[PDB]
Amino acid sequence: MKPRCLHLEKGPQGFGFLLREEKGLDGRPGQFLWEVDPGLPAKKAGMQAGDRLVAVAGESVEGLGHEETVSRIQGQGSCVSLTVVDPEADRETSV
Amino acid sequence: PRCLHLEKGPQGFGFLLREEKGLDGRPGQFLWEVDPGLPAKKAGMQAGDRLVAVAGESVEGLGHEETVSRIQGQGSCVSLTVVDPEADRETSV
Amino acid sequence: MKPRCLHLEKGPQGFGFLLREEKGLDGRPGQFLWEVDPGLPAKKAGMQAGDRLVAVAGESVEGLGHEETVSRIQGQGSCVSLTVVDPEADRETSV
């Protein structure tokens, strides 16, 4: 999946996503869009649950820890550029 | 890592498995959601768990459908080994 | 269950819980933390869905109504002490 760079403007309820860290098999942390809220900025920009957050403000956050990634998003204030890599829709299953 | 034993119900085990690849491209299978009031939840599973084994056999670095087929292949009862997350590493923004 | 005293700090999207009243069979109100939002202060401060709220800012809210309990939480501003009694999280079933 090609990275997609989206520009969000937050309102009173924020950008509209849940960021959660998961470590891969190599130990390196990934920060994932765990859930994206309907009708809020991220969703309106086409961000999806399962997206990996790969850049904030044009700078890579691939392999970066959670608090460092969150502070980088917070450091940008009202308007933020975020780059994501989308999942394959068929690699989720309810069992 | 914790080994949990689940008994299936009419609506299954009660979790959403989702693949995410790491930076070396290796997939991890993550328990993205654990349904309230269903076996997985009541078996001790957490959302954010990584699935590391099925029926005592490692599924680490295995693809999604291989992983699901192995869980399916076990029928009504299933052993699953998970590694839990740090629950202080999720943030709504 | 032994009560637990949690200390929450409010963020831009609030504390992140739904308070719901349930009355006893005798009509007496109790206030319950019905849902706790992932990634928000309540959750991160260890609150569980199904918690019963028994004190705010050190004062009992046992037997108190809903508007009254909310006002007490609101009265504490950005930082609030909440005392809860946790449920048995395995005593839930989807039918």
Q: Sketch out chain A's domains with CATH numbers.
A: 1-95 (2.30.42.10)
Place of tokens 């849940």: A18
Residue pair C31/C61 in contact (Cβ under 8 Å)? The answer is yes
- Please report, to the nearest 10 degrees, the dihedral formed by the alpha carbons of residues C30, C34, C40, C41 taken in order: 20
Residue pair B78/B43 in contact (Cβ under 8 Å)? The answer is no
Residue of C13, C38, C39 lying closest to A13 (CB–CB): C13
Q: Name the residue of chain A whose CA is nearest to C16's CA.
A: A13
Distance CA C57, CA C79 (A): 9
Which method was used?
X-ray
AA letter at A27: G
Residue pair B59/B27 in contact (Cβ under 8 Å)? The answer is no
- Count the Cβ atoms, other than its own, within 10 Å of residue A24: 20
Q: B30 CB near a chain A CB, below 8 Å?
A: yes
Structure tokens at A23: 């470590």
Closest CA to A78 of A26, A15, A28: A15
Q: B46 CB near a chain A CB, below 8 Å?
A: no
Contact C40 B92 (CB under 8 A): yes
Distance CA A24, CA B33 (A): 18
**Deposited resolution, Å:** 2.0
Residue of B37, B87, B88 lying closest to C92 (CB–CB): B37
Question: C26 to chain B nearest CA, in Å?
Answer: 28
Residue of C37, C44, C94 lying closest to B38 (CB–CB): C94
Distance CA C45, CA B88 (A): 9
Distance CA B45, CA A88 (A): 24
Taking every pair of C-alpha atoms in chain B, what is the biggest distance, in angstroms?
A: 40
Residue pair C29/C65 in contact (Cβ under 8 Å)? The answer is yes
AA letter at A12: P
